[PDB]
Structure 1
Amino acid sequence: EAIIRIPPYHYIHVLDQNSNVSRVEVGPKTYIRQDNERVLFAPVRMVTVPPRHYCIVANPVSRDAQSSVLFDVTGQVRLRHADQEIRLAQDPFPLYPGELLEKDITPLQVVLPNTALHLKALLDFEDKNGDKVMAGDEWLFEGPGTYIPQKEVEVVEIIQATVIKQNQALRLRARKECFDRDGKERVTGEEWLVRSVGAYLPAVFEEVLDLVDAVILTEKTALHLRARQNFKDLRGVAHRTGEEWLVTVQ
């Protein structure tokens, strides 16, 4: 039918095959078609973003300073074919020609007060504070809050804060050379021990091992152990790479 026939917050792409300038006809209206405004698709609803949600739209539209959707000399929509635009809660924005929906509408990303997101940047970019973000930096999203899902970052995994009970410690194994909470250089595979009571939130590098509990030392017993390598114990005694000594209640 030559008459195209639109519901209210709907829009269709008219294929002006005198120019193929496919342009969104934001409804609603009894738009009339010559074969210079050829309709492409159906009156399907094309749902929008509910509050505090996000949708991933392929090939978004380039926007000027006033956030206006630009058109070129022939009237075709100015696109970002090789970009992405994270659309938060907003009106039923017209899907301009080229604008494809990669990910349909999805709920926002939530972290529990003691979980963390391994926020891996996939693409080099600059954060809002604007200091530096390398193409693949690792930074840990903190506890209670909500992250804004961006196109340049990827949530590889959710990191549950492993719990360090008293008389228990976490055998942390870094897989890259870096620092720790205390501040001494932690190298790859160097298993170190943190005794801070609580739910020690693992960093981007700490591979969590088993929770080692403190052995039980009454005056009836003494722990006979061998040092695997040079270090200084909690009491402040230098020990060699295999010297066997006793730790007691004293």
Structure 2
Amino acid sequence: EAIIRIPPYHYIHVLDQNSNVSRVEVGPKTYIRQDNERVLFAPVRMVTVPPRHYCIVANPVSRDTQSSVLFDITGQVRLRHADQEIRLAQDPFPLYPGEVLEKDITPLQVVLPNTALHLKALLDFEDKNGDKVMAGDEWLFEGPGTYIPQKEVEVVEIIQATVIKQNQALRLRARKECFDREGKGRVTGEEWLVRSVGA
């Protein structure tokens, strides 16, 4: 049929065979396709993201500094392809032709008071407060609080802060030329103790 039914919060993709490019078809409207148009799939709900949750879709529609969906000169949506987008929490928004949904309403990261998150850049990027991170720079995020899942950063594991009781010490060991608690060149394979009672 040439008659489509898009309810208040659903979307579809239409491939206009004459214009040979596609576009997003957001409601609310019981829209009717032209002879050239052809709907690919049925109304599917718009990508929702509740508060304190997140989602991340690859091939994001590259928007200018005003945040508008630049439709390419051909008529197809302008996608970054390789890049991703960090969708925090927002209204049900419709995906455009070409966006592969990778994360979807996944609960946001919840770091406990006595643990942390091992970080690993995936590529080089400028940090929140203006720092150059290298491909493998090991960042560490102790909380408590909630981390915001990034595309230039990856969480490797969860660190459990070892509790050193009174009259105790924690035997450590370095895996690189790093610096520990009190300024001692800590070479690879070297060991040392912790010296303050506290997680």
Q: TM-score range with shorter-chain normalisation?
A: over 0.9
Q: Distance in 2 between matches of 1:180 and 1:89?
A: 38
Quote how far apart the aligned CAs of 1:167 are.
1.2
* Higher radius of gyration, 1 or 2: 1
Quote how far apart the aligned CAs of 1:91 are.
1.3
Indicate if the aligned counterparts of 2:47 and 2:95 stay in contact, CA closer than 8 A: no
SS in 1 for 2:57: strand
Indicate if the aligned counterparts of 2:47 and 2:94 stay in contact, CA closer than 8 A: no
Indicate if the aligned counterparts of 2:12 and 2:44 stay in contact, CA closer than 8 A: no
Quote how far apart the aligned CAs of 1:47 are.
4.1
Indicate if the aligned counterparts of 2:171 and 2:193 stay in contact, CA closer than 8 A: yes
Quote how far apart the aligned CAs of 1:15 are.
0.6
Quote how far apart the aligned CAs of 1:16 are.
0.3
Quote how far apart the aligned CAs of 1:131 are.
2.3
Greater relative contact order (Cα < 8 A, sep 6+): 2
Q: Distance in 1 between matches of 2:11 and 2:46?
A: 9
Structure 2 unmatched runs, 5+: none
Indicate if the aligned counterparts of 1:3 and 1:31 stay in contact, CA closer than 8 A: yes
Quote how far apart the aligned CAs of 1:19 are.
2.5
Indicate if the aligned counterparts of 2:177 and 2:188 stay in contact, CA closer than 8 A: yes
Indicate if the aligned counterparts of 2:11 and 2:45 stay in contact, CA closer than 8 A: no
Indicate if the aligned counterparts of 1:84 and 1:151 stay in contact, CA closer than 8 A: yes
Quote how far apart the aligned CAs of 1:45 are.
2.0
Identity of aligned residues (%): 97
Indicate if the aligned counterparts of 1:17 and 1:35 stay in contact, CA closer than 8 A: no
Indicate if the aligned counterparts of 2:16 and 2:36 stay in contact, CA closer than 8 A: yes
Q: Deviations over 1:102-157 (max 9, x none)?
A: 12220000110110000111111111211211111111102211111001111111
Q: Deviations over 1:186-206 (max 9, x none)?
A: 1111011112101xxxxxxxx
Quote how far apart the aligned CAs of 1:175 are.
0.7
Q: Distance in 1 between matches of 2:192 and 2:52?
A: 41
TM-score of the aligned structures, taking structure 2 as reference length: 0.95
Greater strand fraction, Structure 1 or Structure 2: 1
Q: Deviations over 1:77-122 (max 9, x none)?
A: 1111110001011111220010110122200001101100001111
Which residue matches 2:80? 80
Which residue matches 2:70? 70
Equivalent residues, number: 198
Q: Distance in 1 between matches of 2:171 and 2:6?
A: 63
For 1:112-151, what aligned pairs fall within 5 Å after superposition?
Answer: 112-151=112-151
Q: Distance in 2 between matches of 1:104 and 1:13?
A: 19
Which residue matches 1:171? 171
Indicate if the aligned counterparts of 1:7 and 1:27 stay in contact, CA closer than 8 A: yes
Q: Deviations over 1:148-178 (max 9, x none)?
A: 1001111111001001111111000111111
Quote how far apart the aligned CAs of 1:56 are.
1.5
Q: Deviations over 1:14-60 (max 9, x none)?
A: 11011232100111112111232210111222440001211120211
TM-score of the aligned structures, taking structure 1 as reference length: 0.76
Which residue matches 1:28? 28
Q: Distance in 1 between matches of 2:27 and 2:37?
A: 14
Alpha-carbon RMSD across the aligned residues, in angstroms, is 1.2
